[PDB]
């Protein structure tokens, strides 16, 4: 029903009813936690709770190499004691449960912030690989500037998350027409998909067509789905990986035409080792599915936000006596909305 987390001295403890929060591109539910401590221990210090989204690298467990490139994305703070928006249902019920030494606190997430994500470590790029985290910590001190202690603090982790929109879009497809140097003899190619959207583990069908009125015979067809990732920390930068691929020697002679449907399926097991592959944010160390495509708001916004990701398909014609040609197409991929 409800979560709770405590200091190593047991005197300070916090209570909360959620771990993950759903973005609507216009709101997300508030942070509405409550903190318990009888002040006879702290006796004069002041009681605070602090929030951040932070970019992180390297494990907390006593790793022995240079680490913690701790660029924050956003931070905030609030005072629990002395007392200083109004409590929610659960906060008031929880007060009645806990008693007068428990005190409520509150945050609201801005709309401009990343999703939780992580990259697959390498066999030498070891330790907790780089990622972006949501994290919340309470502590009590004579000031925000005084060094905190284990006994005086407690720390917890949470996640932002997104889900499938209700409204479908137009059917995606692409086409192009090569024409060669000696004559109007040409090579037209086309393809399309089942939908603009899929769920994880679904099969994707690509319908593909070729009209070959060129001087050449098409030897092979190749098809791929590719991950793209963006980083905007201080520079603009990009990364990519082909994440599933298929091929056939499905020839198309000149003055001939062809079409067929091909099917493809992204999955993790065969790609454990592709260091730099993206995943949705795990809580602490767990396995999980390939990273969901993130959905941006309708507005332009500042775009300065951390990590970003999306996918596309690519298809290529491989042709005798030269002249290979390819085309691409985008699609979204994310989990359906929970009940």
């Amino acid at each position, epitope marked *: 029903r409800v979560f709770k987390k405590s200091s190593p001295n047991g005197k300070l403890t916090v209570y909360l009813g959620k771990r993950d929060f759903v973005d609507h591109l216009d709101k997300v539910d508030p942070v509405d936690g409550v903190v318990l401590v009888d002040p006879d221990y702290l006796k004069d210090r002041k009681v605070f709770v602090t929030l951040t989204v932070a970019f992180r690298y390297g494990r907390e467990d006593c790793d022995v190499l240079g680490l913690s490139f701790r660029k924050d994305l956003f931070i905030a703070n609030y005072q629990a004691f002395p007392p200083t928006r109004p409590p929610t249902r659960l906060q008031e019920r929880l007060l009645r449960k806990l008693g007068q030494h428990a005190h409520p606190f509150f945050f609201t997430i801005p709309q401009n912030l990343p999703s939780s994500v992580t990259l697959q470590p390498g066999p030498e790029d070891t330790g907790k690989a780089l990622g972006v985290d949501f994290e919340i910590r309470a502590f009590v001190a004579k000031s925000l500037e005084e060094k905190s202690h284990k006994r005086n603090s407690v720390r917890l982790v949470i996640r932002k998350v997104q889900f499938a929109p209700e409204k479908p879009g137009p059917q995606p497809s692409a086409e192009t027409t090569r024409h060669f140097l000696m004559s109007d003899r040409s090579l037209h190619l086309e393809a399309s998909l089942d939908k603009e959207l899929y769920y994880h*583990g679904e099969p994707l069908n690509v319908n593909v067509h070729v009209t070959n009125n060129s001087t050449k015979t098409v030897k092979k067809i190749k098809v791929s789905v590719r991950q793209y990732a963006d980083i905007v920390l201080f520079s603009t930068a990009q990364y990519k990986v082909p994440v599933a691929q298929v091929e056939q020697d499905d020839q198309v002679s000149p003055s001939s035409t062809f079409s067929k449907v091909y099917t493809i399926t992204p999955f993790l097991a065969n790609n454990r080792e592709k260091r730099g592959l993206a995943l949705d944010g795990k809580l602490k160390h767990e*396995d999980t599915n390939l990273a969901s495509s993130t959905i941006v708001k309708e507005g332009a916004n500042k775009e300065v936000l951390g990590i970003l990701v999306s996918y596309r398909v690519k298809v290529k014609l491989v042709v005798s006596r030269g002249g290979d040609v390819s085309v691409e197409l985008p699609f979204v991929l994310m989990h359906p909305k929970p009940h």
Partner: antibody
Amino acid sequence: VQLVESGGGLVQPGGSLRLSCAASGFNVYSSSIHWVRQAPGKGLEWVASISSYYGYTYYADSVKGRFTISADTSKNTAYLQMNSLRAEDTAVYYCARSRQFWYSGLDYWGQGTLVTVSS
Amino acid sequence: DIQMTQSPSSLSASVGDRVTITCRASQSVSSAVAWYQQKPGKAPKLLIYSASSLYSGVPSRFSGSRSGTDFTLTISSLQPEDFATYYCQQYKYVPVTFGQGTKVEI
């Protein structure tokens, strides 16, 4: 949606007798497959299972080594082969499916064959 | 092992009655629990999962709740075709674990 199974009979112990279960209505990369057995006057028991997407298997201790499982995506079909047949492995066996994201109990069920072994 | 024990074992049920059935554990599990019913020789079918999530199509006569290690399955009104045996299961850890069944003697 359907699930169907094959392979059984009253077979003298010490051999091996392959089990196959084939599925329709859903695709195996979205799903994980389990087998379960029951006995006279006794309820169900989980034996082993496969998750395609991550590629993992697990077994009950009493069937480690003796049992082996597999599936192929070309057919949306699952298999297991268990070896040196012994009498105590006489039971009804079932194939059953599940949602990968996220486990919510066995929501569809195969017919379930008796397998028996003795002198 | 994750030790399991259902209760009780039998009861009269001439059409209409309200009865509790419980399933008890050696260690705590938050929600990872579900239950099924099954006439002998055929496929088990679920009623309840996540310790309170009623499955589709189930008549509202079924319900249940949790308290720590203690799980309660409830039938508010025994029915002339829900005359049957019943089975609990818990799956926070592999291997999964479960109970033994129930009678219908009028």
